[PDB]
Design a protein around this ligand. Structure first.
Ligand SMILES: CCCCCCCCCCCCCCCCCC(=O)OC[C@H](CO[C@@H]1O[C@H](CO[C@H]2O[C@H](CO)[C@H](O)[C@H](O)[C@H]2O)[C@H](O)[C@H](O)[C@H]1O)OC(=O)CCCCCCCCCCCCCCCCC
Ligand code: CLA
Ligand code: CLA
Ligand code: CLA
Ligand code: CLA
Ligand SMILES: CCCCCCCCCCCCCCCCCC(=O)OC[C@H](CO[C@@H]1O[C@H](CO)[C@H](O)[C@H](O)[C@H]1O)OC(=O)CCCCCCCCCCCCCCCCC
Ligand code: KC2
Ligand SMILES: CC1=C(C#C/C(C)=C/C=C/C(C)=C/C=C/C=C(C)/C=C/C=C(\C)C#CC2=C(C)C[C@@H](O)CC2(C)C)C(C)(C)C[C@H](O)C1
Ligand SMILES: CC1=CCCC(C)(C)[C@H]1/C=C/C(C)=C/C=C/C(C)=C/C=C/C=C(C)/C=C/C=C(C)/C=C/C1=C(C)CCCC1(C)C
Ligand SMILES: CC1=CCCC(C)(C)[C@H]1/C=C/C(C)=C/C=C/C(C)=C/C=C/C=C(C)/C=C/C=C(C)/C=C/C1=C(C)CCCC1(C)C
Ligand SMILES: CC1=CCCC(C)(C)[C@H]1/C=C/C(C)=C/C=C/C(C)=C/C=C/C=C(C)/C=C/C=C(C)/C=C/C1=C(C)CCCC1(C)C
Ligand SMILES: CC1=CCCC(C)(C)[C@H]1/C=C/C(C)=C/C=C/C(C)=C/C=C/C=C(C)/C=C/C=C(C)/C=C/C1=C(C)CCCC1(C)C
Ligand SMILES: [Fe+2]
Lengths: 173, 34, 35, 37, 45, 28, 61, 58, 451
């Protein structure tokens, strides 16, 4: 149990990966646990790719664009047009992968697994025990990566330095 | 007399002014819920 | 001129208050088709 | 003036504003087509 | 100048008279039923 | 033979065309 | 690139005329909504794709 | 006719003429009577039909 | 077909939109199609004014009313009110045109095949007019949407490029508003100010700080009230006070938007801060004071003592004394002595117009502004002939301020008429005598004779 001085939340049986009974504020109750699980997986995956993007944008820059001082400022130096192309592409992906159901009501109509968008092109998730281990690994890595992204974005905003550049040139504020 | 800008004005005006009545006539021809 | 101003303010406030709290007093019920 | 990439489409842009009036007339025509039932 | 008030003595009637009218109206409203209805208007008085 | 709503529509368009040519002649 | 932009905008205009006319026509008619709503949505997606393509090419490069 | 109106006003001061005043009173009171009679009849009709538009109930 | 004729609804063809009162899905379709119409006009007229824009003439000499609205927001405007780029106007027009296509498709779909009543298929969207809780929820959602729009204006003014401040030193420029007026005293003393001459109620906002700060206030108030109405149901006094039907809500909205139309007409006629004269043109007071001020300058420079020149009635011909004791411009423009303009405030002391600052501290751009504003006065005709009604047909100018003010005053009065009509009919339909007097029980016949 993650919080020993509080009770185990009533809706956290332990079926999902990474469930250690950590919900003191009780979002498991009064909401849909599948919705929260898919939201957690989506945030984890987005930040998980975002950390790698912040690492790559320091040393690797696409020849079409001009690199900024920080990967945070790389959002501004690229033109406004093309940014909305990314916005609309993500909208199309989130519409087609979710089956054009986009609300807490109509989603999970077929009761699919939360976070299972049917995207396994390499076929890694075949063995169910390995599937559960990879579920746990993915969820814990997302829980680490969201905190990491929230840290590194603010570090790049405050110090105006890259993350590796900041780690090699550590200084007080 | 014949100005390409005026010609395109009249063509666009004709298409706009006949689009809607075309919708009504075509719905009446298919016996839709007009 | 101040005394006239305060008298006029009092009168306007009195009549506007009567108007406002009269139309709040279930004015839609005051029709011959009620009950 | 329009940008030169879209300057040839000026007549359509000139016609465009009065189209809601045509929508009102279209409502009247639609009511005429059903015999004002 | 809010509400055309330049002397603070003008605020006494402007605030006071609606209070008394509201007291009378509040007696009237406390005499009422004051539970929700499902209709276009309330026929109870 | 022809439904009357088509006749009324054509007549209204022709009347508005007469109005338009009169206004154009007023402006020219 | 002008000319190409004009062709794309003209195709968008013709497709918009086709939508504006036909969508209510094949929409109100008996049947043809559950039968051809896939075609309607495909035409709408083509229209949105044309809009996006012209948005990208407005930049002349 | 507008020229005639202003010409008669300028050369005659016809607004000051009391018979023209009676004529204006008659015209405006006739418009008043027409509007008020139409409104009064349209707003005191009997409920002779179930339709919300009451023109067919006659 | 039932529901679309007079035999099944009781409404004729000319009152056929009242067949949608209890048909919620088709009513939603009608609303969305009308929204598509509004956005379509926005885009089409924006592109029309872009296509008709002459780069030499100002915006107010070309009969443009939508381009000035974007010029206020700082798109494509250089210092001094110069229009340097019209591409953002084109972007706005095209975006509105595409959005209108989307909204029109939605309106058609919900009008024709989308379900007629939403109360069984989609209960989260279905409603009854007599259900006060759901209607208040919808009202709160729309209040929060409006607050989001007001905060969009705030974000545009404070962070994204800023807005055009005509009171900026040098002649007006697009300025980031970094310190908005968040003091509730100023913001709500604007609201409680008298609407008469010299005060102007909320038409007299004369700086962008007050505008942005009170828009922050409006956004906060709207969002708080929206959540308040999402989470509450009307109190007993409100339940006794109001009629709970769709037509009654329509009448309330009609009177509110009629008042808004009147207020916007007065904004367009008098305000030169939110309606800068570099774009909308000078106001009537601004034009008259510009003429008087330019004559004052031409007579002070070309040898004529303006402060001692006695007029035909013993009053000031060029400079006279205000009824409150300030130095104002003389002549028939003395009624417009409440004018505040960016080209005259540097030349204005606490006693009115300072003669020393008039003869010493004139910047040339103020001369250009006053020379420009004195000719294009807001006086025109319905056939677009400039000048007074006794002018010949050679000047083609009617001020955009005149068009906006007249149109919105017309619409405000018309929507007051609509409010009266719909409020009366809502009361009569709630009480139950909107179809006429019952012959069996006439209310008058059961009363005592009055005399
Ligand atoms: C009922 C029937 C109404 C239709 C009238 C006939 C339509 C065609 C005639 C017409 O209109 O006339 C033709 C004109 C186009 O004519 C051009 O109209 C121009 C209008 O001038 C504008 O532009 C000029 C410079 O371009 C100046 O800037 C001038 O100030 C400015 O007004 C000039 O007159 C040109 O010389 C002339 O060629 O159509 C117009 O403008 C189009 C106007 C239609 C839209 C009007 C919307 C309503 C505006 C709010 C009205 C407020 C109402 C208050 C009550 C009154
Ligand atoms: C803003 C204008 C507006 C709007 C949005 C509506 C909307 C509506 N009216 Mg209505 N009406 C209007 C003005 C308007 N009216 C006016 C001015 C009058 C007086 C003449 C009427 C008189 C009237 C009557 C008498 C009745 C309605 C009814 C209706 C409803 C059903 C209509 C129907 O069955 O369509 C059928 C029409 C067609 C099949 C032909 C039109 C096809 C489309 C809509 C034309 C436009 C298509 C567009 C150009 C293309 C867009 C596609 C997109 C992809 C771009 C609908 C919600 C009915 C109702 O209450 O239903 C319960 C009804 O009985 N109206
Ligand atoms: C948001 C605005 C709004 C909305 C949603 C409605 C909605 C409605 N109104 Mg309404 N109305 C409004 C504004 C509005 N009105 C205003 C501003 C006025 C004052 C002019 C009126 C006056 C009015 C009357 C008198 C009547 C309605 C009626 C109706 C109902 C049927 C409408 C219909 O089928 O139209 C069909 C549309 C047409 C036939 C198109 C007519 C086009 C007109 C003739 C153009 C000319 C307008 C003219 C220049 C304005 C006169 C000047 C002005 C100063 C008065 C419907 C509930 C009718 C009803 O039965 O109520 C339940 C009814 O009898 N309304
Ligand atoms: C404020 C405007 C408004 C409102 C209240 C609604 C409300 C609704 N729409 Mg709708 N719609 C709108 C604008 C609006 N729409 C516009 C602008 C379009 C054009 C893109 C559509 C296109 C549209 C379609 C194509 C469908 C709906 C459907 C629905 C219903 C299902 C809820 C939903 O959308 O799931 C939320 C979904 C995603 C967030 C609901 C009553 C559905 C319906 O009625 O099914 C029968 C449906 O199939 N709408
Ligand atoms: C479009 C704007 C709008 C509209 C139409 C309403 C409508 C209403 N409000 Mg309201 N309100 C709004 C914005 C709005 N609110 C905002 C922005 C706030 C925050 C300041 C409030 C705060 C508010 C309170 C505190 C109360 C109302 C109440 C009411 C109801 C009676 C109002 C009355 O008689 O006067 C009525 C349903 C009263 C009510 O019935 O409460 C639910 C009430 O006590 N309103
Ligand atoms: C809301 C309307 C529905 C309200 C229901 C009540 C009906 C009230 C009937 C109105 C009568 C009240 C008359 C007072 C108005 C008046 O002139 O006050 C006159 C006072 C000003 O008062 C003057 O102020 C001057 C300022 O220097 C000086 O102090 C003068 O001494 C003082 O007399 O004005 C106000 O109180 C205005 C308050 C804010 C109102 C602005 C809204 C008005 C614009 C919208 C209305 C048009 C649409
Ligand atoms: C989400 C990923 C994504 C997708 C799926 C996608 C699809 C397409 C397609 C369809 C097959 C075409 C045909 C196309 C073409 C162009 N793209 Mg896209 N594009 C994506 C990403 C970006 C980004 C990030 C930018 C960008 C741009 C351009 C420009 C340059 C215009 C110009 O130089 O002005 C052109 C011509 C840049 C931009 O628009 O601004 C400069 C820019 O920054 N694109 N693009
Ligand atoms: C991996 C994993 C897990 C995990 C985990 C992990 C790694 C959890 C890690 C959590 C951590 C490390 C959170 C760190 C938060 C830091 C904060 C809030 C700093 C705020 C600074 C502020 C506000 C500031 C400031 C300032 C600024 C900028 C302005 C200045 O004027 C002032 C000041 C200087 C004060 C768990 C255990 C859940 C298990 C799970 O199965 C998987
Ligand atoms: C619960 C727990 C487990 C065990 C450890 C411990 C005891 C410490 C305990 C505490 C955990 C804590 C304190 C977790 C803290 C989590 C926090 C503060 C997460 C915050 C993340 C912030 C994020 C993403 C910000 C994202 C911003 C983004 C993208 C975009 C930025 C911008 C860009 C460049 C585009 C334009 C718009 C804008 C805004 C300029
Ligand atoms: C501008 C734009 C950008 C580029 C592509 C795109 C195709 C989208 C293009 C088109 C946009 C749109 C939305 C066009 C829509 C056009 C419409 C609604 C046309 C319909 C017009 C209606 C017409 C004539 C009806 C005229 C009726 C008349 C006289 C007479 C009516 C009468 C009769 C018959 C019955 C009695 C009453 C009355 C009034 C006497
Ligand atoms: C991209 C480009 C570059 C420069 C050139 C150009 C300007 C052409 C530009 C092209 C833009 C294009 C193609 C825009 C497309 C615009 C479109 C399709 C606009 C149309 C929107 C449709 C609308 C509102 C319709 C709403 C439906 C309504 C009211 C129906 C109401 C009614 C119904 C429901 C029942 C009967 C009565 C009535 C009144 C008819
Ligand atoms: C400061 C300024 C500069 C320029 C921009 C900016 C937006 C910032 C602007 C304004 C900012 C702000 C804060 C504006 C606030 C405006 C406000 C609070 C408007 C509210 C008006 C309230 C109104 C009508 C009330 C109408 C209700 C009435 C009669 C009565 C209804 C009923 C009752 C309660 C009594 C009996 C009669 C009846 C009908 C049953
Ligand atoms: Fe009679």
């Amino acid at each position: 149990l993650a919080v020993p001085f509080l009770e185990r939340p009533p809706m956290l049986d332990g079926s999902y990966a990474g469930d250690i009974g950590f919900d003191p504020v009780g979002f498991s109750n009064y909401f849909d646990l599948r919705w929260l699980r898919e939201a957690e997986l989506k945030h984890g995956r987005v930040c998980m790719l975002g950390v790698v993007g912040f690492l790559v944008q320091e040393f690797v820059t696409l020849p079409m664009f001009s690199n900024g001082v920080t990967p945070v400022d790389d959002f501004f130096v690229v033109p406004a047009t093309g940014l909305w192309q990314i916005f609309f592409t993500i909208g199309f992906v989130e519409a087609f992968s979710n089956g054009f159901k986009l609300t807490p009501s109509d989603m999970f109509a077929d009761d699919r697994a939360p976070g299972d968008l049917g995207f396994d092109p390499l076929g890694c998730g075949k063995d169910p025990a390995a599937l559960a281990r990879r579920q746990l690994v993915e969820v814990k890595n997302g829980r680490l990566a969201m905190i990491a992204f929230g840290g590194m974005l603010h570090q790049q905003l405050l110090t105006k330095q890259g993350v590796i550049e900041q780690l090699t040139n550590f200084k007080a504020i | 007399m014949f100005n390409p800008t005026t010609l395109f004005q009249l063509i666009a005006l004709f298409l706009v002014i006949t689009s809607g009545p075309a919708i009504i006539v075509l719905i009446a021809f298919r016996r839709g819920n007009l | 001129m101040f005394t006239l101003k305060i008298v006029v303010y009092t009168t306007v406030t009195f009549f506007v208050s009567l108007f406002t709290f009269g139309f709040l007093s279930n004015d839609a019920s005051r029709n011959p088709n009620r009950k | 003036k329009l940008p030169e990439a879209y300057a040839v489409f000026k007549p359509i842009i000139d016609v465009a504003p009065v189209i809601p009036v045509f929508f009102l007339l279209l409502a009247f025509v639609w009511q005429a087509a059903v015999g004002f039932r | 100048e809010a509400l055309g008030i330049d002397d603070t003595r003008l605020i006494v009637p402007v605030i006071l008279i609606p209070v008394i009218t509201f007291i009378l109206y509040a007696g009237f409203a406390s005499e009422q039923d004051n539970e929700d209805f499902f209709d276009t208007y309330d026929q109870r008085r | 033979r022809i439904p009357l709503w088509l006749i009324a529509t054509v007549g209204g368009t022709l009347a508005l065309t007469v109005v338009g040519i009169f206004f154009y002649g007023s402006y020219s | 690139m002008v000319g190409l932009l004009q062709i794309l905008v003209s195709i968008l205009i013709l497709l918009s005329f086709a939508l504006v006319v036909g969508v209510p026509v094949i929409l109100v008619s008996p049947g043809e909504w559950e039968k051809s709503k896939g075609l309607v949505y495909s035409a709408a997606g083509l229209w949105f794709g044309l809009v996006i393509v012209i948005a990208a090419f407005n930049s002349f490069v | 006719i507008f020229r005639f109106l202003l010409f008669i006003q300028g050369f005659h001061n016809f607004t000051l003429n009391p018979f023209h005043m009676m004529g204006v009173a008659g015209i405006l009171g006739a418009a008043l009577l027409c509007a008020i009679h139409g409104a009064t009849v349209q707003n005191t009709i009997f409920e002779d039909g179930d339709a919300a538009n009451t023109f067919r109930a006659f | 077909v039932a529901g679309r004729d007079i035999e099944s609804t009781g409404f004729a063809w000319w009152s056929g939109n009242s067949r949608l009162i209890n048909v919620s899905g088709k009513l939603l379709g009608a609303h969305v199609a009308h929204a598509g119409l509004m956005v379509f006009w926005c885009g089409a007229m924006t592109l029309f004014e872009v296509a008709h824009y002459i780069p030499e003439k100002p915006l107010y000499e070309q009969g443009l009313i939508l381009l000035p609205h974007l010029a206020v927001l700082g798109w494509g405007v250089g210092p001094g009110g110069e229009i340097i780029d019209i591409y953002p106007y084109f972007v706005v027009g095209v975006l509105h045109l595409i959005s209108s296509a989307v909204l029109g498709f939605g309106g058609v779909y919900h009008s024709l095949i989308g379900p007629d009543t939403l109360e069984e298929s989609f209960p989260a969207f279905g409603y009854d007019w007599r259900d006060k809780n759901k209607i208040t929820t919808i009202l709160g959602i729309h209040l929060i949407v409006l607050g989001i729009g007001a905060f969009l204006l705030v974000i545009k003014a404070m962070y994204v490029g800023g807005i055009y401040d005509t009171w900026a030193p040098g002649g007006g420029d697009v300025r980031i508003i970094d310190s908005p007026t968040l003091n509730p005293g100023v913001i709500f003393g604007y609201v409680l100010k008298s609407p008469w001459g010299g005060d102007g109620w909320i038409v007299s906002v004369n700086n962008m700080e007050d505008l942005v700060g009170g828009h922050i206030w409006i956004g906060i108030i709207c969002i708080v009230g929206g959540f308040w109405h999402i989470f509450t149901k009307p109190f007993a006094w409100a339940r006794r006070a109001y009629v709970w039907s769709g037509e009654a809500y329509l009448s309330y909205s009609l009177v509110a938007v009629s008042l808004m139309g009147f207020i916007a007409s007065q904004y367009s006629w008098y305000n030169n801060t939110a309606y800068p004269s570099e774009f909308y043109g000078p106001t009537g007071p601004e034009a008259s004071q510009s003429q008087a001020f330019t004559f004052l300058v031409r007579d002070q420079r070309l040898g004529a003592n303006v402060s001692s020149a006695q007029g035909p009635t013993g009053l000031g011909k060029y400079l006279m004394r205000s009824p409150s004791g300030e130095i104002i411009l003389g002549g028939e423009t003395q009624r417009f002595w409440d004018l505040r303009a960016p080209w005259i405030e540097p030349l204005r002391g606490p006693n009115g117009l300072d003669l020393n600052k008039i003869k010493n501290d004139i910047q040339p751009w103020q001369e250009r502004r006053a020379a420009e504003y004195m000719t294009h006065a807001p006086l025109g005709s319905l056939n677009s002939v400039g000048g007074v009604a006794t002018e010949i047909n050679s000047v083609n100018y009617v001020s955009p301020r005149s068009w906006l003010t007249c149109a919105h005053f017309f619409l405000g009065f018309a929507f007051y008429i609509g409010h009266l009509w719909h409020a009366g009919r809502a009361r009569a339909a709630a009480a139950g005598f909107e179809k006429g007097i019952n012959r069996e029980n006439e209310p008058t016949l059961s009363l005592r004779p009055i005399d």
